[PDB]
Amino acid sequence: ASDYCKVIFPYEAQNDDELTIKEGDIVTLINKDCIDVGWWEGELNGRRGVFPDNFVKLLPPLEHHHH
Template sequence: AGIVQFDYDAEAPDELTLRVGDVINNVKNVEEGWCQGSLGDKVGMFPDNFVKVSCGQFLVSSKKQSIKVSLFCCSSVHIVVHYKIKVLRKVKATFEYEPVNADELRLAIGDIVEVYRDVSTREEEGWAFGGLNGKEGCFPTNFTTV
């Protein structure tokens, strides 16, 4: 099972609409960046970075060059996992950005951000998901240059 961390509105008939706190069952990785699972009586796809897999279950990408392992609520177990996330590109912050939401990165001028995936939607363009100084989150791409 997995717990939804961020709201997501389905954009296609085979996708699930997610709300923070929803529990997704039978989670499996089906393609790069996407999982499939069941919410209530509906089975559908959703972005893999919107859900954390629960207690001791692992979500591992099927791509050999990129393995992503997610864990949730294993407070009594200490697990060390070495993994490599596929970096699409690196960008440099040209403006400061203060996060508006908890899932966003703070940018300072000159920061180098690793971009893991573009997360723009029809409603909101110009966003990417990446890593900076050991933290991961979304950031506006118009505050950066390649």
């Protein structure tokens, strides 16, 4: 039952704990409760980290059939 969000603004990680996200990226949301107010933890294409929560848009959980 994984949550997903779509990146609306890009963000380049500035330390080890951040996640670099590009516009259009579909990020797996891991945790909304992080040490920093306004930041979420996510996973993307093998990496993981925190990003600002208003750089992204929550998606409906609907997914087309896969192979």
